[PDB]
Structure formats: structure tokens, C-alpha cells
Amino acid sequence: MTHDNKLQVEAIKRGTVIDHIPAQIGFKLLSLFKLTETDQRITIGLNLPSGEMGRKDLIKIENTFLSEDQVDQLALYAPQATVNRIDNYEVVGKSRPSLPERIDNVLVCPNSNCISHAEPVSSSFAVRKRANDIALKCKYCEKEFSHNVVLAN
């Protein structure tokens, strides 16, 4: 029941469908969260129009199931976005990434003298709604950085 305006086939059995990802995100989410490291049928539609959400972006991963854990982790890039849980074609669930209290194994601590860079541990950050932006605090060095400056993988 996607929409209408000239046809092409496009509906799946079970899986997940991150809907309403803004532009130049979709690529980022596939890379960061490695949502492409699987044999599953993935359909990334970019720029495809959605009113207010003029140039939205979309991704659909078959069989794949996000976790409250995972989903929340998207509020750092595409917060407004809505996760639609489609099971047996029926949209069974529907979340919206709210804010997680800790981001693990994804980011890289900008503090070059942080122990995390040498030892075999997993990076980890506490998320905080600073004022304008979100404030990220390294678990180890205790420094907090603009959620914008903290890099990743």
C-alpha cells in the first residue's frame, strides 16, 4: 500500500523497513550499522518523494529484525524516522528511534590520548541532550564531544 504513480513490483514477506530517513543518511546507516553485511534481500530507495518528507530515503531488509537496542541507535542520525515492522506482509509493528543512553562499538573517541585507541576494548559513549545538539561522553577518558564531531566505523 506504498503509494501510486506508475508501477514497479515492491512488497515483502517479513523483515524490517526503516521509513523516513532523510537524504545522505541511508548510505551512512548501511555503512555504520553494517546493515548490508547479510545475504538478505535489501532494497534501498533513495530520494523517493514523500510530501513534507519531500526527498525522503528508504531501506528494506528482508528477514532482518531490528531491536529496541538497535532502533534507538538511529536517533543519532535519522531520529524522526519510523521503523515499520512488516511480518507476513502485515505491518505488525512501528517504532521511532528515541534516544539511547549509551552508543557502543560504533564511534571512535576523538581524544587521541584515549586508552581506547591502544587497548583491545570496545568504544562506548554516553549520549546526552546537551542544549542545541546531543553531547557524547567517552566511557574511558570522560571527555564529552559534540555528537557531530565524534567519528565512527
Binding site: 581524544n111 590520548n113 584515549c114 586508552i115 581506547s116 591502544a118 587497548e119 583491545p120 576494548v121 546537551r130 561522553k137 567517552c138 566511557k139 574511558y140 577518558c141 570522560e142 571527555k143 564529552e144
Partner: protein, 310 residues
């Protein structure tokens, strides 16, 4: 089993006014009535990977003053970590299988935190990690501050120096924002200013704080003038402009100084506190240092001993 028993003492941001008041009262009872065997049979690793004269030595005298034994190093150059390429993670993994506690100082931030994820049951005390925290410094500064002002609530506090890399100011500032009414004054070159995270925590907490360009601009309204060394070894090359102290306390600056105001400093000082200050009544750094014995015996007593020392 007292609140801090078998607890890790990594950062002043994990402790609370109660925890801190727990330590200073113990500090006090210990000073008045020593307990020579309070740690009989314990073996503690003193692992310093960065230099130290007071932290290590006061730490070790403290273990001994309580009957404990000590194993360790003061330089990692001859450790397997230093000549054979071992990780700190493996280091703490093997060490935590010999001793009862690990007191460690390390050149990188969060190294004390890291060791906690690999020491198993053995608690990790942070004798300083890069420019992050220095919690046991904070403990003796509090004890010395209460000793000389009668309290820790509603104090006028000036911190001069390298506030950016001073791990001592990071802890202490966090420790006093846990008390009520304390007022802060900050005097530092603009390149070595207190980090944002601290000024924020202050604002959220409604603590009052202001910058100043002269010690003299606060000399009259302060109870504790906390002097610091420019953490030279931590400066980036592009900061080599602030390697020499800009604010030097000389005796004649203690002229309009409040009668109860003391000059504290975690040491070692270089050129920021002239030697004439040494013999005025406001100089309290060498007593501050000597108070390290008590804040430290107390902490050990609490982490490694179950019942409130009787």
C-alpha cells in the same frame, strides 16, 4: 560492609558527598588512632606508568603504616609491557591474580577505567590517568580544606593554572560542586581553561563561577587559593606558548588576603609559587601533602576492609 568496600575508586564523578564524607571522617579517626595491622596479610600492587614522588610514596607508606605488603613498579620500561609488547589489558589480567588491590597511575586517560574491566574481583584505585582524574588527590585536598576552614560547604574557591590538563582540578571541582554554596573563580591562560564538561556541570547545578585575569582580582574574597603546575608534559606543540607560568604567587600578594585563606597546590610547583610564600602563614601546600597519608590510609581501609573500622 561499608559503602566503599571492595569498590573501585576511578573517578570523583562516581562518588557522592556521602562517600566523600565517609572517607574524610575515617581519615580523621585514623589520624587520631592508627591501626598498624588493619591490613595485615594484604598484598597491594603499586603500578606507576607515569612519574610520581608523593602519590606513590604516600601510597606505599600508607599500605605499610597499615601492615599491608607492596609489590610493583615505578617505570614500565622493564616490565613485559615495556620491553615485550604486552597490552595493559593482559597486564592487569595477570596482576589481578596475585594481589588484593591495584593502585595505578598511567599516561593515558581512561586507563584506570579499562583495568576495571579486566581485574576481576580486585578493586582498582586511580592514582591519576593522563589529564582526566586524580581522585585520591581530591580526597586529601578536601581533608586539608576542612582541616583549615572547618567546612566544605559555602567556600570561595580560586583555581589558578593549567585547568585544562590539571587532572587534580577536574576532580576537585567536581568534588566541591557536590557541596552547597561553594563559589568558584578560575584564572588560566585561555589555552589552558577549565574544560566545557566541567563548566556545564556547574551551570546545571546552579553553581556560581567566573573567570578572572589576576589572582589579585580575587585575593580578597577567597578562602582557598588552589595553585597548579602547567602540565608541561601534556601540552601540544602549538600550546608551547603557555609553558611558562603567567600567574606567580609572591608573598606581597597575600597582603589583602583574608586571614584564614590558605594557599594549596598539589605539587610539584616550579615558578608559580615563589619560595618567600613558603614562610608566610597562608602557605599550606607542604601540610596538604603530608595529609596525603591519612586520606590514603583511610581509603585503603575502606575498600579492603568490610566493617567500619572499630
Amino acid at each position: 560492609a561499608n559503602p566503599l568496600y571492595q569498590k573501585h575508586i576511578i573517578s570523583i564523578n562516581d562518588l557522592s558527598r556521602d562517600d566523600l564524607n565517609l572517607v574524610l571522617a575515617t581519615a580523621a579517626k585514623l589520624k587520631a588512632n592508627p591501626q598498624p595491622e588493619l591490613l595485615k596479610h594484604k598484598v597491594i600492587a603499586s603500578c606507576f606508568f607515569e612519574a610520581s614522588t608523593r602519590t606513590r610514596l604516600s601510597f606505599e607508606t600508607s599500605m605499610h603504616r597499615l601492615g599491608a605488603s607492596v609489590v610493583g613498579f615505578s617505570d614500565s620500561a622493564n616490565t613485559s609491557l615495556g620491553k615485550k609488547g604486552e597490552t595493559l589489558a593482559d597486564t592487569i589480567s595477570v596482576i589481578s591474580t596475585y594481589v588484593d588491590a591495584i593502585v595505578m597511575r598511567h599516561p593515558q586517560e581512561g586507563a584506570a577505567r579499562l583495568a576495571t574491566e579486566f581485574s576481576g574481583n580486585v578493586p582498582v584505585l586511580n592514582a591519576g590517568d593522563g589529564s582526566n582524574q586524580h581522585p585520591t588527590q581530591t580526597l586529601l585536598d578536601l581533608f586539608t580544606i576542612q582541616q583549615t576552614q572547618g567546612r566544605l560547604d559555602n567556600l570561595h574557591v580560586a583555581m589558578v593554572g593549567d585547568l585544562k590538563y590539571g587532572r587534580t582540578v577536574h576532580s576537585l571541582t567536581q568534588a566541591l560542586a557536590k557541596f552547597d554554596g561553594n563559589r568558584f573563580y578560575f584564572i588560566a591562560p585561555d589555552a589552558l581553561a577549565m574544560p566545557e564538561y566541567i563548566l556545564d556541570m556547574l551551570d546545571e547545578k546552579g553553581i556560581a563561577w567566573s573567570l578572572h585575569s589576576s589572582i589579585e582580582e580575587v585575593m580578597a574574597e577567597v578562602d582557598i587559593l588552589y595553585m597548579t603546575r602547567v602540565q608541561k608534559e601534556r601540552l601540544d606543540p602549538s600550546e608551547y606558548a603557555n609553558v611558562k607560568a603567567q600567574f606567580v604567587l609572591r608573598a606581597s600578594d597575600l597582603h589583602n588576603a583574608k586571614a584564614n585563606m590558605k594557599v594549596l597546590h598539589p605539587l610539584p610547583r616550579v615558578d608559580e609559587i615563589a619560595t618567600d610564600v613558603d614562610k608566610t602563614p597562608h602557605a599550606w601546600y607542604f601540610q596538604q601533602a603530608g595529609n596525603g597519608i591519612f586520606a590514603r590510609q583511610a581509603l585503603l581501609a575502606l575498600v579492603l576492609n568490610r566493617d567500619l573500622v572499630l
